[model samples]
Target: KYFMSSVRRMPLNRAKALCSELQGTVATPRNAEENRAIQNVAKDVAFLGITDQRTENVFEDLTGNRVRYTNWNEGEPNNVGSGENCVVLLTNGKWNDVPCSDSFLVVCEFS
Candidate 1:
């Protein structure tokens, strides 16, 4: 797949919107190889287009994809009622569920 890494920081929602506009969505790496690929390209923290707004703990991408593959950090999606509805890609190559409003870098995937 063709993917593009972005430099500007953007909120999860904003990143999602921009990806859709580009005919894509934030990167959703499906395996360790894919994860490493995206992480390698991404310069820093970024949004990965996963959200659990529909059902707490149940996250879905723009395409309504499932969490078949995950790389969440040691303690994440804590959903500790903090309502962390958005997912991010940390520079250390780990995923973390955070507030949707927080801004971060972005990675867009395409055909």
Candidate 2:
């Protein structure tokens, strides 16, 4: 497994589209080790494949499957402001839920 991190900032949807163009999707790290591996390629905060767009507080990856592992920062994914539906990979390899509209770097994984 490997990840390709993009420096260009874009909204979640745009980032997703870009990644698909490269034959990949936003990165989905399945465990602590995988999370760190993805983070290693990311120089800036980047998007993960998980999102709760379909159901509030219920995150699912691009494959529409519930995540089996997570690394949320303490007190995070609060859906802060009640609009945070997209998840981002932090520098520390922790996760945070943010709005899908906010632009950020992207990480694509090759499984």
Candidate 3:
């Protein structure tokens, strides 16, 4: 289990670094319900650990976990420029692929 932190505005890579500092990765909702649970506190777009660093279409968290329980927004993940590999939970409790360097608040957690 992990505990989420306050919104920490930063780039995806930086957000990853901070989570590492806390001995954890950014929050990776293990299930669909968990996704909304985290968003309940955030109530805004924030970072999650989902990413496709290994393969363009196969997304996994920083801990090498993947889930179809993802909440991707409609018409999303266009994978534009092939750089939109980072995943985020939007305000409406949906996910979207974005660049790994885009700055934004990340909801972090620790085991």
Candidate 4:
């Protein structure tokens, strides 16, 4: 499980960095509920790595804002069949599965 800093004084840049560092770590959530909870606390959290499913807009919906990324795994986010759209967060910060409609947890961050 992950805990939000209670200090409430973390700078925006620092917070972003912290979230980025935590993206794919074991601390990151692997289920839908936990991922939603994380987004509630930090909308700008950067993902360690994303697949090729055009997640830019997806995160925007979860965070109520727009987000961008520069790193993505090749030939990923394919939205392959078998309900793989669920971008489940792995322990190494890489996401698996495609299809945006699949219900899965996401990391939200702001910077």
**Candidate that would win on lDDT:** 2
TM-score, model 2 to reference? 0.96
Q: Provide the lDDT at 18 for model 1.
A: 84
Query: Candidate 3: global Cα-lDDT?
Result: 0.81
TM-score of model number 3? 0.88
Scored by CA lDDT, what does every candidate get?
Answer: 0.83, 0.91, 0.81, 0.38
Query: Runs in model 4 with CA error above 4 Å?
Result: 1-61, 82-84, 98-111
Maximum-TM-score candidate: 2
Q: TM-score for model 1?
A: 0.92
Off by over 4 Å in 2: none
lDDT of 1 by residue, 29-67 (tens): 888887888888899888887788788888887678777
Clashing pairs in 1: none
* Pairs in steric clash, model 3: none
Ranked by TM-score from best down, the candidates are: 2, 1, 3, 4
Q: How well is each residue in 30-86 modelled by candidate 4, as lDDT tens digits? A: 355655555454333323223333443253222233325322246555555554423
Task: Provide the lDDT at 9 for model 1.
Answer: 93
